[PDB]
């Protein structure tokens, strides 16, 4: 439900497995996504005890909703490191208070 409401915040799931957050994840994510529009922030958060395909959440805050829509349309179903990425929106206010485990 929240994942279908367009905001400037994009959530990426399934980028890497649980316990597989590496140091280059932020740079690879942000530099590619800069082509949908200006990126303000890139946040990596790992939900403890979550399943392999849900555990690692990568958030991007774009400057504008139009960029975010482009990113969600292009990144959902896209491969990253052999994994099929899931892309959706995230509530801005929840993202900004670090409520990163909703939905």
């Amino acid at each position: 439900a929240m994942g279908k409401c367009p905001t400037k915040v994009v959530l990426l799931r399934n980028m890497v497995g649980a316990g597989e957050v590496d140091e280059d994840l932020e740079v690879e994510t942000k530099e590619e996504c800069e082509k949908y529009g200006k990126v303000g922030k890139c946040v990596i958060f790992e939900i403890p005890g979550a399943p392999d395909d849900e555990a690692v959440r990568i958030f991007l805050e774009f400057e504008r909703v139009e960029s975010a829509i482009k990113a969600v349309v292009d990144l959902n179903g896209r491969y990253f490191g052999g994994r099929v990425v899931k892309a959706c929106f995230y509530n801005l206010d929840k993202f900004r208070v670090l409520d990163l485990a909703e939905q």
Partner: peptide, 6 residues
């Protein structure tokens, strides 16, 4: 690797 599309 850039892992995009790989």
């Amino acid at each position: 690797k850039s892992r995009w599309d790989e």
